[PDB]
A paper describes a structure:
It was created on the basis of the isolation and phylogenetic analysis of a novel α-amylase, designated AmyP, from a marine metagenomic library. AmyP exhibits high substrate specificity for starch over pullulan or cyclomaltodextrins, efficiently hydrolyzing starch into glucose, maltose and maltotriose. AmyP is a raw-starch-degrading enzyme (RSDE), thus making it of potential interest in the food processing and green-fuels communities.
Substitution of the glutamic acid at position 221 of AmyP with glutamine (E221Q mutation) resulted in nearly complete inactivation of the enzyme. Peptide sequencing of protein bands from the dissolved crystal sample by sodium dodecyl sulfate polyacrylamide gel electrophoresis (SDS-PAGE) and liquid chromatography-mass spectrometry (LC-MS) showed that partial degradation of the SBD domain of the AmyP-E221Q/γ-CD crystals had occurred. These observations suggested that the E221Q mutant possesses activity for γ-CD and the WT enzyme possesses activity for β-CD at the high concentration in the crystallization drop, thus producing maltotriose from γ-CD and maltose from β-CD, respectively. Stick superposition of the active site of AmyPΔSBD-E221Q complexed with maltotriose on the structures of GTA and TASKA indicated the remainder of the strictly conserved residues for subsites −1 and −2, including residues participating in hydrogen bonding and aromatic stacking interactions. Interestingly, the -3 subsite of AmyPΔSBD, which is formed by the hydrogen-bond-forming residues Tyr36, Asp367 and His368, is novel. In this work, the resulting glucan in the crystal structures, however, was not the cyclodextrin, but a degradation product, G2 in the case of the WT enzyme and G3 in the case of the active-site mutant.
Residue numbers in the entry: 0 to 496
The structure:
């Protein structure tokens, strides 16, 4: 079974806001795990997310992805580590019940229905390769087979097909993020994809515009590895697709290594570094649809990497400029994109920056869960300061801009310049053509652009400020402030491109 081309077209417009449920908004102070991995209140729940949908929608996002919300049943006598694990949802017991520390089944149904009203898709987190030891049998009487971690395929396939279809039929969720997807063999992903596509076409709901639609059936694999492994374990071969979308970890690293440093300190790369990462998409088969995120619940926050690398701090202007540069790269990236909660306000963990190794789990400070900080949602859990609001407004402008210009979400990309100081892409989709330019240097600069090299015949219009740029002797001259990005509409493209 090939990938569905209608879904691929729809997937390019996904602007996904990721929510780690336990550490997000404590909306019902009567329920919650109260322990976990991270420094948050550990009492996030479905009411908190429900209270946050309007905020999320005004960001410009059109989807939410929740970490697993299914029932992780406590085993009598289990140690404190097993209580913390239960709060993550990643080692569950009952795939067919909502964990009562997060809420009820009725509240889940209310969450999805309300998100659908406000114009948001909903994705759940499917862990189909491992589970807690006390896993509970399915409604149709199935159980997964083999070890708890990993389970055996194909014996466990009937069980996980039942999981994947249950929440689509019951709540009409729009798809699945697929945890540690290399644990499930590619053969089985095709079969689970068939069930999801079938389950999704067998139910409908009314979207925010009155239209009755099927749930999307989106599926995106999490494979924390490089391009050859994402290809081998996730996308599959040319002509023989396994999954159709995986997270773009390689380009995520290029971004933070250009505009900050990664968890290991590799940093201060330039525009050439971004461009080489995008060119490595050639290693994927033609059906592959990578999904670019900047961070997630397993990665240190951008803001803390800036501080870790001694690059910038929230008091300094470069800290905010560098956030905007990275977020602008994402907004220009063709394909689905995902934003981890708090990136839109440059969140960081006060008093933390350097890596903490010894005894880090109990302090909530290991690199793989330190981003699970309590959600600062403006108007709900926090009043933002002027710099946080300025960044959130900018993320809104990017997402609104992206929703309006096909060249950003599904454009063909052609690189114009990639050097130590600037990165300039040409994006074209139908007759929407624009130039994306971002500075990768702390110095101000002027960019010379030959009108013929970018297939431009008329003017360039800054899509955010409105400034017209006119060519003189066949050249545009644009000034770039340090780490400043501009989206320039090619107002009258040439005969071809
Ligand atoms: O004490 C051991 C270990 O516990 C914690 O690790 C857990 C993660 O916090 C938890 O989320 C889950 O990890 C999953 C990832 O989040 C998920 O994105 C996927 O890609 O991989 C994991 C499989 O679900 O489970 C791990 C433990 O297995 C804590 O964060 C660690 O520091 C600690 O070492
Ligand atoms: Ca709560
Ligand atoms: Ca910090």
């Amino acid at each position: 079974h090939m990938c569905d081309s209608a879904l691929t077209a729809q997937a390019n417009d996904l602007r996904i806001y990721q929510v780690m449920v336990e550490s997000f908004v404590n909306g019902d102070d009567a329920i919650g795990h109260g322990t976990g991995y991270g420094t948050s209140h550990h009492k996030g729940d479905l009411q908190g997310i429900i209270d946050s949908l309007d905020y999320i929608e005004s960001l410009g996002m059109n989807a939410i992805w929740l970490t697993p919300i299914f029932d992780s049943i406590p085993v009598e006598g289990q140690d404190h580590w097993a209580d913390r694990l239960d709060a993550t949802g990643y080692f569950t017991s009952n795939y067919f019940a909502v964990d009562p520390r997060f809420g009820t089944m009725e509240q889940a149904k209310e969450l999805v229905e309300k998100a659908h009203e406000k114009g948001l898709y909903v994705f759940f987190d499917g862990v189909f390769g491992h589970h807690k030891d006390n896993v509970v049998p399915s409604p149709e009487g199935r159980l997964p087979v083999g070890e708890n971690n990993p389970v055996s395929y194909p014996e466990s396939l009937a069980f996980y097909q039942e999981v994947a279809t249950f929440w689509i039929e019951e709540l009409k969720i729009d798809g699945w993020r697929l945890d540690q997807a290399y644990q499930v063999p590619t053969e089985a992903w095709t079969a689970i994809r068939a069930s999801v596509d079938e389950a999704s076409k067998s139910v409908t709901y009314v979207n925010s515009k009155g239209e009755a639609v099927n749930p999307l059936g989106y599926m995106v694999a999490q494979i924390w590895n490089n391009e050859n492994y994402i290809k081998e374990t996730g996308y599959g071969a040319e002509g023989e697709p396994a999954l159709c979308s995986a997270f773009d970890f390689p380009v995520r690293y290029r971004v933070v290594e250009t505009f900050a440093a990664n968890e290991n300190g590799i940093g201060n790369k330039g525009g050439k570094w971004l461009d080489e990462g995008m060119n490595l998409h050639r290693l994927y088969p033609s059906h592959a649809q990578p999904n670019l995120m900047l961070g997630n619940h397993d990665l240190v926050r951008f803001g803390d990497l800036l501080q870790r690398g001694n690059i910038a701090s929230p008091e300094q202007a470069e800290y905010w400029e560098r956030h905007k540069a990275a977020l602008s790269f994402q907004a220009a990236y063709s394909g689905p994109i995902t934003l981890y909660y708090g990136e839109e306000i440059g969140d960081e963990l006060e008093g933390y920056a350097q890596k903490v190794e010894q005894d880090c789990a109990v302090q909530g400070l290991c690199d793989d869960h330190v981003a699970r900080t309590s959600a600062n949602i403006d108007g709900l859990t926090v009043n933002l300061n002027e710099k946080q609001r300025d960044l959130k407004q900018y993320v809104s402008q990017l997402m609104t801009l992206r929703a309006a210009h096909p060249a950003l979400s599904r454009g063909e990309r052609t690189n114009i310049v990639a050097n130590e100081t600037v990165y300039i892409d040409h994006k074209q989709a139908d007759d929407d053509a624009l130039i994306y330019m971002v500075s990768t240097t702390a110095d101000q600069d002027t960019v010379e652009l030959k009108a013929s090299d970018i297939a431009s015949d008329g003017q360039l219009v800054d899509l955010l400020t409105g400034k017209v740029h006119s060519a003189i002797n066949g050249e545009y001259q644009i000034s770039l402030a340090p780490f400043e990005a501009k989206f320039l509409l090619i107002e009258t493209p040439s005969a071809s491109g």
